[PDB]
Swiss-Prot record, chain A:
The keyword Metal-binding does not apply. The gene is rpsC. One of its GO terms (cellular component) is cytosolic small ribosomal subunit. InterPro entries: KH_dom, KH_dom-like_a/b, KH_dom_type_2, KH_sf_prok-type, Ribosomal_S3_C_sf, Ribosomal_uS3_bac-typ, Ribosomal_uS3_C, Ribosomal_uS3_CS. It comes from Bacillus subtilis (strain 168). Part of the 30S ribosomal subunit. Forms a tight complex with proteins S10 and S14. CDD domains: KH-II_30S_S3 (cd02412). This is Small ribosomal subunit protein uS3.
UniProtKB/Swiss-Prot annotation, chain D:
Disruption phenotype: Cannot be disrupted; as the protein decreases in cells 70S ribosome formation decreases rapidly, with concomitant loss of uS2, uS3 and YugI (general stress protein 13) proteins from the 30S subunit. GO terms for molecular function: rRNA binding; structural constituent of ribosome; zinc ion binding. Belongs to the universal ribosomal protein uS14 family. Zinc-binding uS14 subfamily. Keywords: Metal-binding, Ribonucleoprotein, Ribosomal protein, RNA-binding, rRNA-binding, Zinc. This is Small ribosomal subunit protein uS14B. The gene is rpsN1. It comes from the Bacteria. The keyword Metal-binding applies. It holds the Pfam family Ribosomal_S14. Signal peptide: none annotated. Binds 1 zinc ion per subunit. Gene3D superfamilies: 30s Ribosomal Protein S14, Chain N.
From Swiss-Prot, chain E:
Keywords: Ribonucleoprotein, Ribosomal protein. PROSITE patterns: RIBOSOMAL_S9. HAMAP family: Ribosomal_uS9_B. GO terms for cellular component: cytosolic small ribosomal subunit. GO terms for biological process: translation. Gene3D superfamilies: 3.30.230.10. This is Small ribosomal subunit protein uS9. Belongs to the universal ribosomal protein uS9 family. Part of the 30S ribosomal subunit. GO terms for molecular function: RNA binding; structural constituent of ribosome. It comes from the Bacteria. InterPro entries: Ribosomal_Su5_D2-typ_SF, Ribosomal_uS9, Ribosomal_uS9_bac/plastid, Ribosomal_uS9_CS, Ribsml_uS5_D2-typ_fold_subgr. It comes from Bacillus subtilis (strain 168).
UniProtKB/Swiss-Prot annotation, chain F:
One of the primary rRNA binding proteins, it binds directly to 16S rRNA where it nucleates assembly of the head domain of the 30S subunit. Is located at the subunit interface close to the decoding center, probably blocks exit of the E-site tRNA. It comes from the Bacteria. This is Small ribosomal subunit protein uS7. GO terms for biological process: ribosomal small subunit assembly; translation. InterPro entries: Ribosomal_uS7, Ribosomal_uS7_bac/org-type, Ribosomal_uS7_CS, Ribosomal_uS7_dom, Ribosomal_uS7_dom_sf. Pfam families: Ribosomal_S7. Belongs to the universal ribosomal protein uS7 family. Keywords: Ribonucleoprotein, Ribosomal protein, RNA-binding, rRNA-binding, tRNA-binding. Part of the 30S ribosomal subunit. Contacts proteins S9 and S11. Interacts with VmlR. GO terms for molecular function: mRNA binding; rRNA binding; structural constituent of ribosome; tRNA binding.
Length: 206, 95, 78, 60, 125, 149
RNA sequence: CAACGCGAAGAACCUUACCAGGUCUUGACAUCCUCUGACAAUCCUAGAGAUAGGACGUCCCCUUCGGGGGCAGAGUGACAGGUGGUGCAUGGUUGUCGUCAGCUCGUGUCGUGAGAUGUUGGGUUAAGUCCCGCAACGAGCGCAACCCUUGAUCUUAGUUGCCAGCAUUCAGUUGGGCACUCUAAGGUGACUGCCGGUGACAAACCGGAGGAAGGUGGGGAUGACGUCAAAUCAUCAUGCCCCUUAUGACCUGGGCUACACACGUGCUACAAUGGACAGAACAAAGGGCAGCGAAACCGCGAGGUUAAGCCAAUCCCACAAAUCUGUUCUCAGUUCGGAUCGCAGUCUGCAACUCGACUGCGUGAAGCUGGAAUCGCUAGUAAUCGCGGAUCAGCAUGCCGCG
RNA sequence: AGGAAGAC
């Protein structure tokens, strides 16, 4: 009884996939293994706040590129992450891996980082309203064309669970050539479990 | 010799088609145009909800398509050159 | 068991055959509803698991083609 | 109790007809797809995320 | 050797009419045991009689796909294309007479939750 | 809302006999056509030399004798559910006439289809008809209750 | 309404949670302490389950001879597990009103205030869609368009299609060629683009023309703020409850499929707009390698045999029925209808009794178009006729899709 | 100026 997920509605027609390959008659166990890579990358790089990973097959070699938007607390001495990730990933999948990193300039317009920012202030236990206003101000001072933010759950009141919305600019969810970046994040506090949905209208596609 | 290629993304398969035609033409390999082969379809139907409301369903399309090229003359040095030529990771070449 | 004969639990098959080739003995304890009654099993006493107990049944001569399973119905009605 | 039957799923069974299918990314039987080994729930969630590159919205 | 195309209801047909003595044939099998359903007979006899070009051209017809009445509509569109190709001097008279519509009436896509893409199953309070 | 009608033409405008062209090629479809129409044509022949004249005018006065002029609808006024007679548009007249013809022909019941269809054609040809009597039932209700206007 | 062919796109045993029986305590499931550093399989006794002992029967790699690379096991506590309760403790999803056209904000006016205005009024639209007055001027989510598919054509692209134009044969397979259907990229295209009449000349409405379609061409996807404390603790997760010598575990058998009844949804009919038999037919869209399986042979039948071809526009499913011509039945519980019942089988599977499907027989039931009421349906729509597909070893009248 | 119709 809600809107259909906009990234899942945009993929295939305007949005290119995050995976660019084919597997025949071994499709199932490649999906199982590369989701094991994606959960392991998420679990060990949640501190480094990856926006997205994207993979490809190189005829029994796999190429991984990871979008993290900062080298600073991520690359270490420069080779530490690539040795500690490439040997570990070789140990897990048993196949030849290659890894590369990419950065996002104007780094406050990426939705997964925005929802992780909101979630991080929720375990930081600053007030949710201050989190919404500060993130709205951060996204407009970075510059954008529209932001809609939602946080639902038990927001400090024990006996009621209600959502809060905060928006600015235009976010049409029904124009197809619109390039909404959408993100859902999950926050665990002593009050309970809180859901964040942020979706950003960055630009236009002709 | 016939070369097939089958994948999901008809854009990058099209630029792969003129790139292989360009390499074969600059090698002078008695070129033939890439013939469009019919697609293959699989439409899956998923319960929209989790526990209830059987009349609420959604459909998910999978479409994958193939094209074919043919080389008449042998030309083995240029054939080995286009074997050793690099390909993108979506073009999904079959010999 | 449609073309190649009755399909049974061979361990207690050979147990009851080594019973009856020597003597006549007490009831045969079985959990197995699986078995078809072989024609050489005439006159024996079988304790079949009904789900709650092991009901006793005597085997008559007329046990022509049907399996052992119908001796203990598993439902009680009125 | 789910991971007891998950242990049944990864362990080979006694007889080969006793073997059944479970999607094993999320935790259920009952409408697993064979050619993905994902059921409806975790299939549609991870498809809206965007993996399984053949799959998109369907209309004709 | 004028050549026309016709499409109606998931079926195609191609027609070739050359100057003959007025012979009409589909698939090189003749009218009696090849053509039932006399709607096809009025199909094959209407436009040549309404025009003055009846006994001049002979027509070979090739057929692919579909059923009988949709096949007849494909015959209609094929011979209409063949005449507008051959003799365009009264093609405008054929236009406002009609028969050039090429109806888009094809089978409807079945809708989920519905039986025949219009029929909801049944309702009760 | 509003009514709207379309245009469509089956037959040719000129050199086209209306009833003969209808009789050979028009408005009976969806199978069981061929043998039924041949035995129906020879039913027309046996009634042709059963009557002592041309049979088309007695078929057309059969159509007149089945063809209704008025019918009556029910309108809600008061506590009685009164009835209002009405003048009828010609397409509705044709639809009603053919509809009563076919459903009472299939409804009375007889040996088989061609002789029963001819049976109610001749039953409409003479004035003493069953569905004809129903047409005069529609009138005798209409000019029994046309004091309502 | 918005539960009742619903979660289930598939219960013989696992699925399975529920019941009975016999069995477990760091347990198969995650990590630390210490050894052996590689573990297991084959046949018995019970075996149905753990267990207990037996025949080869705890068997890698780096190695400055110290030790490590986590796979296998062994003893230990921190432990792990809960398809157990709480949807009124929650996120995450979904239906509903409803594709209904509405829901609000900024600035500013009016009001002591709650509030109002914009968002009302006139003309049209499917629309809060457009335009003219107006203390309002604007903006945002919605509507419409952009997206996909079906509707005609140009260029390029002709095999695993097309046989037009040709020579060839019962297999028109072939030697030769892309113009057509066909597969498909760029497009061409329909947008109020012209005439007349209304409409204060505006927006719009009606009738006309090359056109494949004229007034969003047909359909899909798309579902605003919110309501129903609507549904789900059955994917995951602090909140309490019992356990951890047990609501947590292992397996065997049973039950989820019972049955005096009442209901929801469907199938098959009650028939001569037919039944039976015989002959000629027209061919959409999907699936195929622990597979799809052609030909031929055997079989009063589902099927069996060795098996050519196919990793697929070639091979198989794929033998489409309703349709069209002949004989019969002549109005009947019948040559309708096929359900229950016995016999004998085929296939799958360790196993078809509880509880699979299908076939050959024989048996032939109720039923002669159904009261109160009640359901769906507007340019292939209802109705019929089939055809695929999905979960799956096997099981359609269920569901999805196609003609 | 054109029907009597209860309760939650």
């Amino acid at each position: 009884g809600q809107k259909v997920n906009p990234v899942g509605l945009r993929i295939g027609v305007i949005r290119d996939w995050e995976s660019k390959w084919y597997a025949g008659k071994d499709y199932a166990d490649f999906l199982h293994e590369d989701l094991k890579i994606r959960e392991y990358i998420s679990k060990r790089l949640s501190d480094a706040s990856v926006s997205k990973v994207e993979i490809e097959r190189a005829a029994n070699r796999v190429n991984i590129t990871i979008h993290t938007a900062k080298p600073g607390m991520v690359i270490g001495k420069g080779g530490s992450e690539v040795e500690a990730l490439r040997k570990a990933l070789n140990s897990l999948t048993g196949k030849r891996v290659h890894i590369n990193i990419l950065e996002i300039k104007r780094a406050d317009l990426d939705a997964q980082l925005v929802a992780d920012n909101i979630a991080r202030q929720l375990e930081n236990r600053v007030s949710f309203r201050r989190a919404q206003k500060q993130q709205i101000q951060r996204t407009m001072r970075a510059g954008a064309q529209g932001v809609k933010t939602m946080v639902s759950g038990r927001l400090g009141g024990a006996d009621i669970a209600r959502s809060e919305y905060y928006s600015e600019g235009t976010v049409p969810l029904h124009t197809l050539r619109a390039d909404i970046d959408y993100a859902t994040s999950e926050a665990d506090t002593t009050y309970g479990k809180l859901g964040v949905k942020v979706w950003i209208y960055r630009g236009e596609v002709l | 010799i016939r070369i097939r290629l089958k994948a999901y993304d008809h854009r990058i398969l099209d630029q792969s088609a003129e790139k292989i035609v360009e390499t074969a033409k600059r090698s002078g390999a008695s070129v033939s145009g890439p013939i469009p082969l019919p697609t293959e379809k699989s439409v899956y139907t998923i319960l929209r909800a989790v526990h209830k409301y059987k009349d609420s369903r959604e459909q998910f399309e999978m479409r994958t398509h193939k094209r074919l090229i043919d080389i008449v003359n042998p030309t083995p040095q240029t054939v080995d050159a286009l074997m050793r030529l690099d390909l993108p990771s979506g073009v999904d070449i079959e010999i | 068991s449609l073309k190649k004969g009755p399909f049974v639990d061979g361990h207690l098959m050979t147990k009851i055959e080594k019973l009856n080739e020597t003597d006549k003995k007490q009831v045969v304890k079985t959990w197995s509803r699986r078995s078809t009654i072989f024609p050489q099993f005439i006159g024996h006493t079988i304790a079949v698991y009904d789900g709650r107990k092991h009901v006793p049944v005597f085997i008559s001569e007329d046990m022509v083609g049907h399996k052992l399973g119908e001796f203990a119905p598993t439902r009680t009605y009125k | 109790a789910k991971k007891s039957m998950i242990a049944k799923q990864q362990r080979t069974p006694k007889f080969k007809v006793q073997e059944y299918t479970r999607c094993e990314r999320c935790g259920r039987p009952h409408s697993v797809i064979r050619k993905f080994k994902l059921c409806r729930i975790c299939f549609r969630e991870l498809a809206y995320k965007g993996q399984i590159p053949g799959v998109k919205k369907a209309s004709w | 050797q004028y050549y026309g195309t016709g499409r109606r209801k998931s079926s195609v047909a191609r027609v070739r009419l050359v100057p003959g003595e007025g012979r009409i044939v589909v698939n090189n099998r003749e009218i009696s045991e090849h053509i039932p359903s006399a709607a096809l007979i009025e199909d094959i006899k209407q436009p040549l009689t309404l025009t003055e070009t009846a006994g001049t051209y002979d027509v070979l017809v090739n057929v692919h796909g579909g059923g009988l009445s949709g096949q007849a509509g494909a015959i209609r569109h094929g011979i209409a294309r063949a005449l507008l190709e051959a003799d365009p001097e009264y093609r405008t008279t054929l236009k406002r007479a009609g028969l050039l519509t090429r109806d888009a009436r094809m089978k409807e896509r079945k809708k989920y939750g519905l039986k025949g893409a219009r029929r909801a199953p049944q309702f009760s309070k | 809302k509003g009514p709207v009608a379309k245009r469509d033409v089956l037959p040719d405008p000129i050199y086209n006999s209306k009833l003969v062209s209808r009789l050979i090629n028009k408005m009976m479809i969806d199978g069981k056509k061929g043998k039924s129409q041949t035995i129906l044509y020879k039913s027309f022949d046996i009634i042709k030399e059963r009557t002592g004249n041309d049979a088309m005018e007695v078929f057309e006065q059969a159509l007149k004798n089945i063809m209704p002029v008025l019918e009556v609808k029910a309108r809600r006024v008061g506590g009685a559910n009164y009835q209002v007679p009405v003048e009828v548009r010609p397409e509705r007249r044709t639809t009603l006439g053919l509809r009563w013809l076919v459903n009472y022909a299939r409804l009375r019941g007889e040996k088989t289809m061609e002789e029963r269809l001819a049976n109610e054609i001749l039953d409409a040809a003479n004035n003493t008809g069953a569905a004809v009597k129903k047409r005069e039932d529609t009138h005798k209700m209409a000019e029994a209750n046309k004091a309502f206007a």
